Design a protein around this ligand. Structure first.
Ligand SMILES: CN1[C@@H]2CC[C@H]1C[C@@H](OC(=O)[C@H](CO)c1ccccc1)C2
Ligand SMILES: O=C(O)CNC(=O)C(=O)O
Ligand code: NI
Ligand SMILES: [Sr+2]
Length: 299
């Protein structure tokens, strides 16, 4: 496995160097000793195991007008079941916003299992906290002031809990800024561009896989790579994974961070509305970066 595993209790400068190199080379890495309670990660996975085992009577409560929603605008934050492209569906996703944790938002979350709201609220807070630490390591690697992304660029925090039914014998960037993913079974693969080859991202049940989204690829002016990754169906196990997809509010304007831009390293994208990007990203799957192709410049 060539995917870096970065221990967040090493000396501070080694963390920054390792994260920086991973962001430049792959756009994907794993973190361990990351400060999120292991007992909470286990409880959250147990919550989704139970949720996906509930009977139809419960699951229908998350299916607007009798069927799962699609990832299409407007992308609401209330909890809903989603599907995304059929295969030989292939994936059920429970998704909802998590930030800020409002009463009206929490009130849309599952009531069963009865621990869902307490466990997943605590998990959201912890995963967010860790996500903001990692962005700050990225700030130091890019030479940006700490806290640069602690604003509307991280205003939206979508939890996407995925269930992949087994089959005996899908690639994308995430369009947002940064994603943390918890898994405990093989199935996640990263595209190694230089070989045009898919490789396994080893499942470490107490680690988080960190992958950079298209928005960060653009804002770093391609100093950092976004991760192109996919999931292959498990031949034996139903697989569950928990993604926390953090990024801009839909009222944001995305552009290469001006402080990174020079005469020698000009901007590679013009500014665009995130909401306009989001529409293309969700609709046009003709290429991985179709969402940002209309904004490319200096090529
Ligand atoms: C596998 N798919 C991919 C990634 C997750 C899942 C569902 C969809 O991605 C999203 O819905 C996220 C939600 O924040 C998104 C939506 C608009 C703009 C930026 C990011 C596409
Ligand atoms: O489920 C996995 O292991 C990977 N999930 C995704 O890439 C996603 O939901 O965007
Ligand atoms: Ni993804
Ligand atoms: Sr139904």
């Amino acid at each position: 496995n060539d995917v870096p595993i970065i221990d967040l209790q090493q000396d501070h400068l080694l963390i920054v160097q390792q994260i920086t190199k991973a962001c430049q080379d792959f756009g994907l890495f794993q973190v361990i000793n990351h400060g999120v309670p292991e007992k909470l990660m286990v409880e959250a996975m147990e919550v989704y195991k139970e949720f996906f085992a509930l009977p139809a009577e419960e699951k229908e409560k998350f299916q607007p007008k009798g069927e799962p929603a699609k990832f299409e605008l407007p992308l609401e934050q209330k909890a809903k079941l989603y599907v995304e492209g059929e295969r030989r569906y292939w994936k059920d996703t429970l998704a909802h916003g998590c930030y800020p944790l409002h009463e009206e938002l929490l009130n849309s979350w599952p009531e069963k299992p009865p621990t869902y709201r307490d466990v997943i609220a605590k998990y959201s807070v912890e995963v967010r906290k860790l996500t903001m630490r990692i962005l700050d390591y990225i700030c130091e690697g890019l030479g940006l002031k700490l806290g640069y992304f602690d604003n509307e660029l991280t205003q939206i925090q979508m939890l996407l809990a995925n269930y992949y039914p087994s089959c005996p014998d899908g690639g994308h960037y995430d369009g947002n800024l940064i994603t943390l993913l918890q898994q405990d079974l093989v199935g996640l693969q990263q595209l190694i561009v230089k070989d045009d080859k898919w490789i396994a991202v080893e499942p470490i049940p107490t680690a988080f896989v960190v992958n950079l989204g298209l928005t960060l690829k653009v804002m770093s002016n391609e100093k950092f790579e976004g991760s192109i990754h996919r999931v292959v169906t498990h031949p034996i196990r139903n697989r569950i994974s928990i993604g926390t997809l953090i990024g801009p509010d839909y009222s944001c304007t995305i552009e290469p961070i001006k402080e990174l831009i020079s005469q020698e390293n000009p901007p590679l994208y013009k500014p665009y509305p995130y909401a306009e990007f989001a529409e293309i990203y969700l609709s046009d799957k003709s290429d991985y970066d179709a969402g940002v192709k209309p904004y490319k410049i200096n090529q």
